Amino acid sequence: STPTSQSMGMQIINAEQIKKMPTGNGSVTELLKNNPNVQFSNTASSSNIPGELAPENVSFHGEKFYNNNFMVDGLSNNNNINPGANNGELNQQPDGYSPADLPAGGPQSFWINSELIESLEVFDSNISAKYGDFTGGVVDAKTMDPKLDKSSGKISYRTTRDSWTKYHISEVISEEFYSGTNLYYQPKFKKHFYSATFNQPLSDKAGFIFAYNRQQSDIPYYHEYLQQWDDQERINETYLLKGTYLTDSGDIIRMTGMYSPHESKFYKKDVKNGGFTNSGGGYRFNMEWEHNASWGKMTSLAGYQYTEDKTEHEADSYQTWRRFSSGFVSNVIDWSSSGGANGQNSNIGGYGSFATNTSSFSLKQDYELNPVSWYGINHQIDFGWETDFYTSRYRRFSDVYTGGVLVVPTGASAGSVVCQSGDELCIPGEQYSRTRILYPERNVQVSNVNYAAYLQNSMSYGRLEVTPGVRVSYDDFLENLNIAPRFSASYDVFGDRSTRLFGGANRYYAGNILAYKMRQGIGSNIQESRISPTAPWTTPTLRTGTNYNVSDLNTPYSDELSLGLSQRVMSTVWTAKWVNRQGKEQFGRETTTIDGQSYRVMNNKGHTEGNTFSLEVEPISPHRFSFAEVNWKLGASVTKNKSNSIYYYDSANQDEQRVIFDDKLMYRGDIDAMNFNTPWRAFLNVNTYFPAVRLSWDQRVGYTAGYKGYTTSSIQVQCPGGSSACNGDPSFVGGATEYFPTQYDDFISYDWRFSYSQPVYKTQTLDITLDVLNVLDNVVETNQTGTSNKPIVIYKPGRQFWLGVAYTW
């Protein structure tokens, strides 16, 4: 029932469109590659990493990728704690690799698959006052719902593998890649994508759906000095149990359980017993009550959500031993974690278990009053409220002792090492730790309430629809009262839907980033020392490490302006919209002094202009022929995005640095956005169904502006006597970092996806499915790294086959 002016600002992708579009894993974000206002993070598709199951990071209209409202069934699917870690780049020491890491499951708590979703509502603009806690878009993943009559269901298996995935990889990383010695170089992998679904009446007005998904990847990893092969394993399970009782009153009570635990078994390079699992996601249970009174509709909701981004290492202490060195060699330590010729250190163990968890109880109530007429205008008064009572908690579960500095008595002194009988930091007759670093059991806790309320009029007269709304909201984290005007108009110009304009002016406010609260003492470690392996641990010496703190902050916001036209040219709807976002008060990092101690502190010093012109052409109805039905959607956009070099909430304000860019001297906040910001796209989905064969051949051909990779100078250009760029400021005596461009060619993306259904008997079908991503196998550049001395280019995947089978009744 969404109104005209807002419907041109949303894209609705139902189960049929999801079955049809060419698909990789089919994360909720991969489905967004048919929205012309979505930019993916440069690395999110990459030949280096075809084993990854995680959501591809998405910017809507140049806003921060962690500032979208990802939703599942109309409830938040967002990480309020650490959503944007490492700018969404695949950091080689995953979060958890070190004892002071605040874990990060990306911006989404639950990683739902395309299998589990019955509609995706992708709101890029003109977004209703119903939706908030974003500066970005909204992606409302309506998961599969009970059917009261069908008794139906599905089982599927989908798979891809290294031998089915052509790799385009740069020569400067090829031997490291094919060695398998790096967590995010994946030359060998297997993916298995299991699912089940049952959709059954308990009684004729009381359906339930049970659904299971199991995205799995196995990925061999090689420790080059420990000389071991270990599988990394990536798993996203999702269990969903949705029930719906349609009462005799016509009011629907819906019970919605979910458990979406995703895990990633990483390892620490050459560390013995060195494995760790970044677990994440968690569970839900909601009750929703859709009441359908004489006034209209009242969708009441209560629900619990739990999220637990957790690292668990395979040990809860960490030791550095020494195999050999000048004047010493050992018989106990039987591995190496280094390659040196004069001496070698050998590492064992890990940093125990630590987690950051949200426990959020949500109340909501959405009202949709029937159209009431006043002063000749019809008013559809939508209104509502929600309250998230939440506790966020980062917490280590056991004291992690770590092995500090090792003393290794040489020659005739070696026999002096006699350990205390319980000691983890001594080896008898070999060596002992002189210092021990305790990362203690800790609990940082923040209990908060976020209130929000809205009114959303949607009101019509004389061919207009005008949809004024507001969305007041208050988080007791920052204590900000945010008032968020939303305006979205439309006019059917020529008496009919064939020619109709629209536009809007909306302020969007984002959710909390609790990372600086959860870190308030992360890296607090107590050092202790001992003179001999029999002596006591003498002197607890706390270092609080890199401290973090909360500060008085405005909420990050995005001022949208939008305008557009929808036109019915000769059997096709052409919808064109411009959208401009002034992302403002966006978070960055600062250092400040409190009670004489230095703290890292969040600031509002970031901003992002993002600008799009987007075009969306589709037919009025599918074409039909003797052979086929053929259906298509030509999306396109031209885009321009900007940033301070405050890339995310941990980035410092490098805005004031001098750089040489576009062949002139300028401040670093005047660079074009390095991530996101491919200039343009033009994608044609065409879908074909051959009734003579039951074969569907669904294909996406998409031309896009080639990546413009920038590499830094290793030495800063002394402006005075260093570059013609210096004419940009002849007063500058200092040095500038130069950026050198490489403009890779504008490229044809081409993905196929076939699916043939075979009736097993009258009620049931077995479907064979075959994606072929990059059917051309073309080399496409997608990121570029480092200085001009080490230009590591990264590419989008080669030809990748995904076979699938789906039995259904």
Numbering used by the authors: 59 to 867
Give the text the authors published on this PDB structure:
The best-studied member of this class of TBDT is FusA from plant-pathogenic Pectobacterium spp., which functions in concert with the TonB-like protein FusB and the protease FusC to import and cleave plant ferredoxin (10 kDa), thereby releasing iron from this abundant, iron–sulphur cluster-containing host protein. TBDTs are a broad class of nutrient active transporters that couple the proton motive force across the inner membrane with active substrate transport across the OM, via the periplasm spanning TonB protein and inner membrane ExbBD motor complex. A previously reported crystal structure showed that the extracellular loops of FusA are unusually extensive, at least in part to help form a binding site for the large ferredoxin substrate. Here, we show that the addition of LPS facilitated cryoEM structure determination of FusA, a 100 kDa TonB-dependent outer membrane transporter from P. atrosepticum.
Given the specific and apparently strong LPS-FusA interactions indicated by the CG-MD simulations, Ra-LPS and Re-LPS from K12 E. coli were doped into the LDAO micelles of FusA at a 10:1 LPS:protein ratio. The Ra-LPS dataset, for which about twice as many images were obtained (∼8 000 micrographs vs ∼ 4000 micrographs), finally resolved to a global resolution of 2.8 Å with the core of the structure extending to ∼ 2.2 Å, and the Re-LPS data to ∼ 7.9 Å. The structure of the protein, especially in the plug and transmembrane barrel region, is very similar to the previously solved crystal structure (average RMSD: 1.2 Å). Consistent with these conclusions, non-protein density was observed at a variety of sites around the reconstruction, both in the micelle and interacting with the protein surface. LPS was conservatively assigned if density could be observed for both its acyl chains and adjacent extra-micellar density that could belong to the polysaccharide chain. While extra density, attributable to LPS sugars, was observed binding to the extracellular loops of the protein (glucose sugars in density shown for reference only), the regions of density were disconnected, indicative of stronger binding sites for specific LPS sugars on the protein surface anchoring a more weakly associated polysaccharide in place. However, the assigned LPS density did appear to cluster into four specific regions which were labelled according to the likely interacting β-strands at the membrane interface (β11-13, β14-16, β17-19, β21-β1). In addition, a cluster of acyl chains, without corresponding extra-micellar density, was observed at β2-5. Despite the addition of LPS being required for successful structure determination, no major structural modulation is observed in FusA around the LPS binding sites in comparison to the apo crystal structure.
